[PDB]
Scaffold this motif. Structure first.
Motif, PDB file in Angstrom:
ATOM      1  N   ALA A 104       0.809  -1.221   0.000  1.00 30.86           N
ATOM      2  CA  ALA A 104       0.000   0.000   0.000  1.00 30.86           C
ATOM      3  C   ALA A 104       0.836   1.260   0.000  1.00 30.86           C
ATOM      4  O   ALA A 104       1.572   1.525  -0.947  1.00 30.86           O
ATOM      5  CB  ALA A 104      -0.980  -0.041   1.199  1.00 30.86           C
ATOM      6  N   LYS A 114      -4.263  -8.150   0.362  1.00 33.19           N
ATOM      7  CA  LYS A 114      -5.645  -7.701   0.482  1.00 33.19           C
ATOM      8  C   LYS A 114      -6.473  -8.768  -0.188  1.00 33.19           C
ATOM      9  O   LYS A 114      -6.251  -9.125  -1.340  1.00 33.19           O
ATOM     10  CB  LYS A 114      -5.851  -6.315  -0.132  1.00 33.19           C
ATOM     11  CG  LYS A 114      -5.084  -5.200   0.632  1.00 33.19           C
ATOM     12  CD  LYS A 114      -5.370  -3.794   0.096  1.00 33.19           C
ATOM     13  CE  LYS A 114      -4.606  -2.748   0.864  1.00 33.19           C
ATOM     14  NZ  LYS A 114      -4.869  -1.335   0.494  1.00 33.19           N
ATOM     15  N   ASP A 238      -2.172   7.319  -3.407  1.00 31.85           N
ATOM     16  CA  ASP A 238      -1.383   6.490  -2.508  1.00 31.85           C
ATOM     17  C   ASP A 238      -0.723   5.364  -3.334  1.00 31.85           C
ATOM     18  O   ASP A 238      -0.986   5.214  -4.544  1.00 31.85           O
ATOM     19  CB  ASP A 238      -2.148   6.045  -1.273  1.00 31.85           C
ATOM     20  CG  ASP A 238      -2.916   4.786  -1.456  1.00 31.85           C
ATOM     21  OD1 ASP A 238      -3.395   4.507  -2.583  1.00 31.85           O
ATOM     22  OD2 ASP A 238      -3.113   4.005  -0.465  1.00 31.85           O
ATOM     23  N   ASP A 240      -0.885   2.105  -3.736  1.00 30.96           N
ATOM     24  CA  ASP A 240      -1.654   1.105  -4.462  1.00 30.96           C
ATOM     25  C   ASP A 240      -2.876   1.672  -5.186  1.00 30.96           C
ATOM     26  O   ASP A 240      -3.563   0.930  -5.927  1.00 30.96           O
ATOM     27  CB  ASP A 240      -2.003  -0.088  -3.608  1.00 30.96           C
ATOM     28  CG  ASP A 240      -2.876   0.266  -2.391  1.00 30.96           C
ATOM     29  OD1 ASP A 240      -3.643  -0.588  -1.936  1.00 30.96           O
ATOM     30  OD2 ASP A 240      -2.737   1.365  -1.850  1.00 30.96           O
ATOM     31  N   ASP A 242      -5.819   3.058  -4.036  1.00 28.78           N
ATOM     32  CA  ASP A 242      -7.168   3.049  -3.462  1.00 28.78           C
ATOM     33  C   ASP A 242      -7.526   4.315  -2.703  1.00 28.78           C
ATOM     34  O   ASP A 242      -8.611   4.367  -2.122  1.00 28.78           O
ATOM     35  CB  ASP A 242      -7.469   1.827  -2.623  1.00 28.78           C
ATOM     36  CG  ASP A 242      -6.511   1.640  -1.469  1.00 28.78           C
ATOM     37  OD1 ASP A 242      -5.597   2.484  -1.281  1.00 28.78           O
ATOM     38  OD2 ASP A 242      -6.561   0.597  -0.813  1.00 28.78           O
ATOM     39  N   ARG A 243      -6.633   5.286  -2.683  1.00 24.17           N
ATOM     40  CA  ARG A 243      -6.879   6.599  -2.077  1.00 24.17           C
ATOM     41  C   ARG A 243      -6.282   7.676  -2.938  1.00 24.17           C
ATOM     42  O   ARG A 243      -5.246   7.450  -3.582  1.00 24.17           O
ATOM     43  CB  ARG A 243      -6.210   6.688  -0.675  1.00 24.17           C
ATOM     44  CG  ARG A 243      -6.718   5.729   0.350  1.00 24.17           C
ATOM     45  CD  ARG A 243      -6.171   5.989   1.722  1.00 24.17           C
ATOM     46  NE  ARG A 243      -4.801   5.547   1.915  1.00 24.17           N
ATOM     47  CZ  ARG A 243      -3.765   6.285   2.304  1.00 24.17           C
ATOM     48  NH1 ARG A 243      -3.872   7.575   2.592  1.00 24.17           N
ATOM     49  NH2 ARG A 243      -2.590   5.711   2.470  1.00 24.17           N
TER      50      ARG A 243
HETATM   51 ZN   LIG Z   1      -3.905   2.287  -0.472  1.00 26.99          ZN
END
Ligand SMILES: [Zn+2]
Length: 459
Positions: A104, A114, A238, A240, A242-243
């Motif tokens: 991440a 994950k 971020d 990976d 996802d943000r």
């Molecule tokens: Zn992330």
């Protein structure tokens, strides 16, 4: 027979460790055997597998894949992709299981898993069950297969086809040398924007700032670049993907609750009565704003896992939380995705003649304290909260005890909760005036002191 793995890598919702220490290639193999065993036990032989851009990625993903294959699973190998692209694969491919090998936003040597199995993420006892399978050698054995799948173009096209940008925008895109560099700048350009790339080269050494927009310092370069280039917006993904962090044309950091005001207005406009989930750290303005537009706000517990679970249980169209995860179900799949969020934001901003600074500044804003952390001890942390929940007196206000104690007054609110991973109490306050802010702080200061007159209250 499987080897002994350290219990410390099996966390509440995922698996995480340090390569060369608590995570080895050997570990990844056995984790694959455990996840594959559990997926087969749930009736799902088909599993998608992806990885991020970390140095350990190629080696470890190969072992993960072999472990799945050795159970008899049919693996769809999507290679190096952002976490949400792996989620996408696990929604559009034959199987409903998927594993994303990623560390991440963490430093280079971290990696992890994950995990989605037969359509659901695992938590708590279910992750512990994986650990147990290995311990007891309670593992499936079979002759599986691997298919290489090129999912990125499909994902790219799925978003591009549904986004309808109006005015051109110049956007600084900072990927922090994480995996979003494989698609975010390209997709954002394809939507119609002019892109100014920062740290878009995938490099697991993270030689510039770490890809973690949750820490403002990791937005300094972005803010400077937006200002220097007179860009319309800045985005920081971020590691990976996802943000995503958001900065306006004047450099203002837009936190997730304020982003959700904008997203909620848009979603509710086409979906009367839509459920919208957010957390107890979000501005009270969000509750009112969603309701005013005809939506159904749900203020819930902190933690992206809990927020997602509530979204599924309520049929919500949109969810978000203060750590930065945003989930769209409307026009989408329901999983968190920084790239999709960026695309949805660009769509909305592009249809407004105002600059991003003014689009966001127009929503009601109140006076807020920086988040407060009070170091206590592991023995006392939950008990302090419990003592408040049993006996505190908050006056005339709406009390929420889903996660700590939040009190909403007519003119502001306060929150106190225990950190789940450190011996610390976490507080937030907001109010329409400085005077009301101080009044609310005083109520909380006094209630804390009523629990333990000697507790160190730094506010
Ligand atoms: Zn992330």
């Amino acid at each position: 027979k499987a080897p002994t793995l350290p219990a410390s890598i099996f966390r509440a919702y995922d698996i995480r460790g340090v390569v060369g220490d608590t995570l080895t290639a050997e570990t990844a193999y056995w984790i694959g055997r455990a996840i594959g065993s559990e997926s087969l036990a749930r009736g799902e032989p088909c599993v998608a597998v992806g990885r991020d851009g970390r140095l350990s990625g190629p080696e470890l993903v190969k072992q993960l894949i072999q472990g799945l294959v050795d159970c008899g699973c049919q693996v769809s190998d999507v290679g190096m992709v952002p976490t949400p692209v792996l989620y996408y694969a696990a929604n559009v491919l034959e199987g409903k299981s998927g594993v994303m090998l990623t560390g991440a936003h963490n430093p280079p040597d971290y990696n992890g898993f994950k995990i989605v199995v037969a359509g659901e993420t695992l938590a708590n006892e279910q992750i512990q069950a994986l650990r147990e399978r290995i311990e007891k050698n309670d593992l499936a054995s079979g002759v599986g297969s691997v298919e290489q799948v090129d999912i990125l173009p499909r994902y790219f096209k799925q978003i591009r086809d549904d986004i309808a940008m109006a005015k051109p925008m110049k956007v600084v895109v900072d990927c922090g040398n994480g995996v979003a560099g494989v698609i975010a700048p390209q997709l954002i350009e394809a939507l119609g924007c002019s892109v100014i790339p920062l740290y878009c080269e995938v490099d697991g050494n993270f030689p510039n700032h770490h890809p973690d927009p949750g820490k403002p310092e990791n937005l300094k370069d972005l803010i400077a670049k937006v200002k220097a280039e007179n860009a319309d917006l800045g985005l920081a993904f971020d590691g990976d993907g996802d943000r995503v962090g958001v900065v306006t044309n004047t450099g203002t950091i837009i936190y997730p609750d304020r982003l959700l005001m904008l997203f909620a207005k848009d979603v509710v406009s086409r979906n009367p009565g839509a459920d919208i989930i957010f957390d107890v750290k979000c501005t009270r303005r969000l509750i009112a704003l969603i309701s005013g537009y005809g939506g159904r706000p749900v203020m819930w517990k902190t933690g992206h896992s809990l927020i997602k679970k509530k979204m599924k249980e309520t049929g919500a169209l949109l969810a978000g939380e203060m750590s930065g995860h945003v989930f769209f179900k409307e026009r989408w799949f329901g999983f968190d995705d920084g790239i999709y969020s960026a695309a949805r934001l660009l769509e909305i901003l592009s249809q407004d003649q105002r600059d991003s600074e003014h689009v966001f500044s127009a929503f009601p804003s109140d006076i807020s304290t920086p988040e407060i952390n009070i170091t206590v001890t592991e023995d006392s942390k939950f008990a302090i909260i419990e003592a408040l929940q049993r006996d505190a007196q908050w006056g005339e206000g709406n009390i929420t005890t889903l996660d700590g104690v939040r009190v909403d007054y007519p003119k502001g609110w306060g929150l106190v909760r225990a950190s789940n991973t450190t011996p610390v109490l976490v507080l937030r306050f907001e109010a329409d005036t400085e005077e009301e802010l101080e009044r609310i702080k005083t109520v909380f200061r006094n209630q804390l002191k009523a629990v333990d007159s000697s507790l160190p209250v730094p506010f």
